[PDB]
Amino acid sequence: MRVAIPAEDDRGIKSNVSKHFGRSRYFVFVDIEGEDVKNVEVVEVPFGDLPNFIKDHGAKIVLTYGIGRRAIEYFNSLGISVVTGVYGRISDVIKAFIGGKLKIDYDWKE
Amino acid sequence: MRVAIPAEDDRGIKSNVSKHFGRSRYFVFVDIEGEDVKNVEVVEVPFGDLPNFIKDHGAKIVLTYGIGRRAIEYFNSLGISVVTGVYGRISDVIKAFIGGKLKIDYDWKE
User: Fold this and answer.
1) Helices H, strands E: what count in chain B?
2) Considering only residues 62 to 101 of chain A, which have any Cβ-Cβ distance to chain B shorter than 8 Å?
3) Which among B60, B76, B102 is the nearest to A77, CB-wise?
4) Pick from A71, A79, A105, B67: most CB atoms within 10 A?
5) CATH code of the domain covering residue B43
6) What is the count of structural domains for chain B?
7) How far apart are CA B90 and CA A4, in angstroms?
8) Structural domain contains residue B106
9) Is residue A33 part of a domain?
10) Residue A82 assigned ligand-binding role
């Protein structure tokens, strides 16, 4: 399926998850088929804009560090699932995600 | 992909989303391919048990009404996304989910 990830840099799968969704200016869209990463797409954000931006790009899951409750709810209303507390290099996150061992910062709100 | 939903009854896609994940005794697993529902599987729960139960059944998304923060985090650590605030007949939820128009109870915590 297609997974969306806010990036800190325009470095694609070598960038880190941006700590603030919403203020982030690059997103990485990763097409996953089984254990296999079939496509990486690295685009920039323009300027419920952001959620609609993500939905318009086909992403059905969003992996983020921090994101507001309202944004999560807006995502959810669009049938999009959000994972919070994710940090680190996006390449590592995608490998963790595929293998059921994601590293979550439980304390991302404090 | 495969979506897991806690059911109030053993009525499958005719049951409602159970209002309490965790105390629920039936789950519905729905295989979705595009706009198409390819398979429905209606099983019962035994007796991070529940999350592992869901992961062991191949579900990568969980749609729930209420669920605890700890359970969500545990799901997330297993690379599983959770949607909260979902209620109603499971057949209606699945149709909403596929079309980007899910109806969310923003106030499911109060």
Assistant:
1) 3, 5
2) 73, 76-86, 96-101
3) B102
4) B67
5) 3.30.420.130
6) 1
7) 26
8) no
9) yes
10) yes
Q: Match 């097409």 to its residue by tokens.
A: A31
Q: Which residues of B touch A35 (CB under 8 A)?
A: none
How many residues in chain B? 110
Q: Are A98 and B79 in contact (CB under 8 A)?
A: yes
Look at residue B30 and tell me if it is in a domain. Answer: yes
Q: Does residue A106 belong to any structural domain of this protein? A: no
- Cα atoms in the Cβ-side hemisphere of radius 13 Å centred on A18: 21
Separation CA B17–CA A80 (nearest Å): 18
Range of the domain at B59: 1-100
Do A17 and A63 touch, CB atoms closer than 8 A? yes
State the residue for tokens 């439980």.
A106
Resolution (A): 2.0
